[PDB]
Amino acid sequence: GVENVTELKKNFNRHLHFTLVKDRNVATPRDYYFALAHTVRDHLVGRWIRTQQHYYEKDPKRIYYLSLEFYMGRTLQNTMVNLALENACDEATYQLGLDMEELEEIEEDAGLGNGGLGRLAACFLDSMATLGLAAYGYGIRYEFGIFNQKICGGWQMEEADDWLRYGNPWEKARPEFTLPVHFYGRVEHTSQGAKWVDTQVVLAMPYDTPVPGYRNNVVNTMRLWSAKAPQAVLDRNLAENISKELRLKQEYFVVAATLQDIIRRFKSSKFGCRDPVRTNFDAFPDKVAIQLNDTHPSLAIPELMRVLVDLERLDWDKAWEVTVKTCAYTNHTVLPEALERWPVHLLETLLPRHLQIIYEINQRFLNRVAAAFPGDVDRLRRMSLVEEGAVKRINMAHLCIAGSHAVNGVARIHSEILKKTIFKDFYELEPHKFQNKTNGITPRRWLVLCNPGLAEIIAERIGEEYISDLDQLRKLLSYVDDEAFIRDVAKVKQENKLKFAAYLEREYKVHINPNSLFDVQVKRIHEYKRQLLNCLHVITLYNRIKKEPNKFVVPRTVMIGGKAAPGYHMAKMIIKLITAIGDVVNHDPVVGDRLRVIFLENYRVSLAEKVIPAADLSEQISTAGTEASGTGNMKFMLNGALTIGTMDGANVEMAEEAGEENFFIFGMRVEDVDRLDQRGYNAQEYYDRIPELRQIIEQLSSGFFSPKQPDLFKDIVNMLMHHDRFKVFADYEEYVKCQERVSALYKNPREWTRMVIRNIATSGKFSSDRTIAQYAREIWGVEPSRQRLPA
Amino acid sequence: AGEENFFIFGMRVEDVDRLDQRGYNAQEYYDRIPELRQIIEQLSSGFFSPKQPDLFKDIVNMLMHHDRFK
Numbered sequence A: 001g002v003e004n005v006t007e008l009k010k011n012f013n014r015h016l017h018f019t020l021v022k023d024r025n026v027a028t029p030r031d032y033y034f035a036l037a038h039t040v041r042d043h044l045v046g047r048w049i050r051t052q053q054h055y056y057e058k059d060p061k062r063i064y065y066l067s068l069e070f071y072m073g074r075t076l077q078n079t080m081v082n083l084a085l086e087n088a089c090d091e092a093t094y095q096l097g098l099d100m101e102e103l104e105e106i107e108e109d110a111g112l113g114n115g116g117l118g119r120l121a122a123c124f125l126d127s128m129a130t131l132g133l134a135a136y137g138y139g140i141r142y143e144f145g146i147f148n149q150k151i152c153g154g155w156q157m158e159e160a161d162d163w164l165r166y167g168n169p170w171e172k173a174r175p176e177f178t179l180p181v182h183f184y185g186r187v188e189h190t191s192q193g194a195k196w197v198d199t200q201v202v203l204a205m206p207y208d209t210p211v212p213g214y215r216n217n218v219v220n221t222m223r224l225w226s227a228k229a230p231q232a233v234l235d236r237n238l239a240e241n242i243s244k245e246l247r248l249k250q251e252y253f254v255v256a257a258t259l260q261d262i263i264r265r266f267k268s269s270k271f272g273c274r275d276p277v278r279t280n281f282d283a284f285p286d287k288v289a290i291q292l293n294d295t296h297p298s299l300a301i302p303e304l305m306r307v308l309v310d311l312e313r314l315d316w317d318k319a320w321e322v323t324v325k326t327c328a329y330t331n332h333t334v335l336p337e338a339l340e341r342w343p344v345h346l347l348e349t350l351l352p353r354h355l356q357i358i359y360e361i362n363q364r365f366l367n368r369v370a371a372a373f374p375g376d377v378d379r380l381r382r383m384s385l386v387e388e389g390a391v392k393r394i395n396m397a398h399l400c401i402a403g404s405h406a407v408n409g410v411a412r413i414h415s416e417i418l419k420k421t422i423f424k425d426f427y428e429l430e431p432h433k434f435q436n437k438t439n440g441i442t443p444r445r446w447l448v449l450c451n452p453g454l455a456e457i458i459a460e461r462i463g464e465e466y467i468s469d470l471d472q473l474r475k476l477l478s479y480v481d482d483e484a485f486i487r488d489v490a491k492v493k494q495e496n497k498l499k500f501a502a503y504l505e506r507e508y509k510v511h512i513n514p515n516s517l518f519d520v521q522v523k524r525i526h527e528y529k530r531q532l533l534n535c536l537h538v539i540t541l542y543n544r545i546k547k548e549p550n551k552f553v554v555p556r557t558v559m560i561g562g563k564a565a566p567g568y569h570m571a572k573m574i575i576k577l578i579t580a581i582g583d584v585v586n587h588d589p590v591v592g593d594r595l596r597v598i599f600l601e602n603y604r605v606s607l608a609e610k611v612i613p614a615a616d617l618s619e620q621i622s623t624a625g626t627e628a629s630g631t632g633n634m635k636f637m638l639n640g641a642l643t644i645g646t647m648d649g650a651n652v653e654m655a656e657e658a659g660e661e662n663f664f665i666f667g668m669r670v671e672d673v674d675r676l677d678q679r680g681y682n683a684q685e686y687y688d689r690i691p692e693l694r695q696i697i698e699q700l701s702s703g704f705f706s707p708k709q710p711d712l713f714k715d716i717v718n719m720l721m722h723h724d725r726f727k728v729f730a731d732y733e734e735y736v737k738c739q740e741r742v743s744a745l746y747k748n749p750r751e752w753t754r755m756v757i758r759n760i761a762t763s764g765k766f767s768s769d770r771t772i773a774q775y776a777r778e779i780w781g782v783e784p785s786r787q788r789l790p791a
Numbered sequence B: 001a002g003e004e005n006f007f008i009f010g011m012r013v014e015d016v017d018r019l020d021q022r023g024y025n026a027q028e029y030y031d032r033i034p035e036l037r038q039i040i041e042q043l044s045s046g047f048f049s050p051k052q053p054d055l056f057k058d059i060v061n062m063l064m065h066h067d068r069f070k
């Protein structure tokens, strides 16, 4: 099938009529989107078959990325970009009287992920394919994502999400490869081994989706499972409900079904032949790599062990050896707090075999710490996998370190903290396991796709090789003083700022001024994230504008967006305050389009692609100490946005890449928060010293912003005043000093843009192709390849 | 009964509202009271919980940093 407008149009038509059984007379925009999606999917499948054949010829080590969420976004345009088809799809479609941008906007984002964890695994699947690695992402196929946020009168309505309601043109149901997953049962320890008998069964049906590497012709596989049930009505609902105990059920569902695939593919290694030959599991860790992305697939370890000892009859030690050499664990928390601990009671009902295996692992493991540090019995208590006390829990992270050969963090400092504080005894016992792998974003969805204009001008100077070697972006430092590049970088951001304003009108019915520096904060509406420090500052801009309604102010559109966890009262109230400041501020005749505050509803990957291109300022203001990575941060950097932030997470390594000089860093640092915790944080001090702050909390509790219900924000005022854990008032003064500096820079266009070129040039470290080449060499034992294949 | 026949101690309603307007900062008390310092030390150190040393650290952090009832 050719990438030549004539065959694209020809095949568009063949898919609309023959595939969809639709017609020019009854077809809708949506119907025309599926015929486009199916035209392009042809090209993706041609490359998929030859890649996959090629892995069977070469027999490489295959990497399996298990994850309980992949934040995939929308496949059509990423497919077009990775397959150099977008322009021909744009000609073809306009030669038939269709407009591709209109159609692209019909695709639903896949409901397969909630947030950063999901977008990481999703960006890793782009770079693993682009780096030619034989990788598979395995997960659950959720029929419904984590709601769709709707704002109804400043309050968040969680609207449901059947993203699959009209089919998905990108996936392929594989009914023939349905496997079983067993639950419950009893363990009969026979003569020649243990048997897990009397189990309830649930079927796991595979659905295949191809992932393209950027222009190298390598297309890999994301394979997600659906649960299918084979009082029976109830026995089928909870079965069918995999898509409390249900999460442990969903986690083992993805583990059990994926590993059957892994051992089948291992064994049926011969090109052509679908029978086994690899019966000797000694090569198993040279051929297989399982990447446990956070503790969620951690049962992959007692599961693999169960298969090799019980079913393949390999003895415990040999099987243990295969297991640790096959697994690795990526950690993403900073809080001891958030680790999964499963009570043993649930585990012995649901998985009585696996609890046996978790206890045997823990007996042997604890015998190893005993010889390594004799005497030491509280170290024993500390390192155990069973945690006793009120409720007896298995600590799943200690299972992953016990059974993996590399545990890593997603940022230098974090990974240091895992050695230093969190998993300190495990670092002391096996220091060699610990590693760090700083996150990244893919330069394809996060630059050449969402921002073809910046990529165009970057390419007119250094060609296109940087898209898979982002470290070539450093050549741009020669152009920092080049007046034509300073003018082109600026013009690109202006055209991106106009485009997003017109969207905001036809989707928000307010007019934003496309000259205002667009200040953008899009994160989970959570207290550690401090959207409230941002509210305190825009109310400051507002008040200041009021007092002297004629002084110059650098015009700003403050856009805040994110989801509030249902059930979290304070999160829902922050959104109501943010939309409430919008009513007062955006209508007050003295301000005009000097300030405008806007809540971006339903933030997700396609909205992210539309806002981050247009941003001038990236709000990275979480309290220092609360954050490990920050992939969004890296997206704003690459797209010509300057960051204002605290020294933490991704902001540390980016200040250090860009040169701190080129960063608006402010406020407390982890040393300073600890001192204030060691001395007592008392918000009433800040309130009393600072008159401009006093005004805000007054405005807030009197009813200024909500005159109809003049005590609506009492919760947020008492919390701020009397129980603010993330010390918002302790960074208020320095936040507004820092901001005053940003506006002063923005008053000078060439010097703003030069700071921007300095940021973009040094952004190369944060491409996920670096993160993946580091995983491949350091953890997986395989070697990145930009070798292109055939066509 | 007559106040004399009673052991009334501590703050009064007026005193706690005064304390709330200035801010209750639990730390101030701890820093100036030696025997209190010895007690919080014992609770963090697994003294009253030898086998699980960190057992009582949740109520310690509460007493010390989020004590709503002074």
Ligand SMILES: Nc1ncnc2c1ncn2[C@@H]1O[C@H](COP(=O)(O)O)[C@@H](O)[C@H]1O
Residues within 6 Å of the ligand: A049, A052, A053, A056, A265, A268, A269, A270, A271, A272, A273, A274
């Ligand atoms: N032994 C084999 N020889 C060559 N191609 C194979 C073989 N096994 C599977 N394939 C290819 O890999 C794709 C996925 O199969 P599998 O990896 O078995 O899920 C198939 O559509 C085939 O194109």
Ligand SMILES: *Cc1c(COP(=O)(O)OP(=O)(O)O)cnc(C)c1O
Residues within 6 Å of the ligand: A114, A115, A116, A117, A119, A522, A523, A524, A603, A604, A605, A608, A629, A630, A631, A632, A633, A635
């Ligand atoms: C980039 C991205 C992310 C990840 O960004 P965050 O910095 O806000 O989350 P954390 O990295 O965990 O701090 C999440 N969601 C979307 C839509 C997106 O584009």
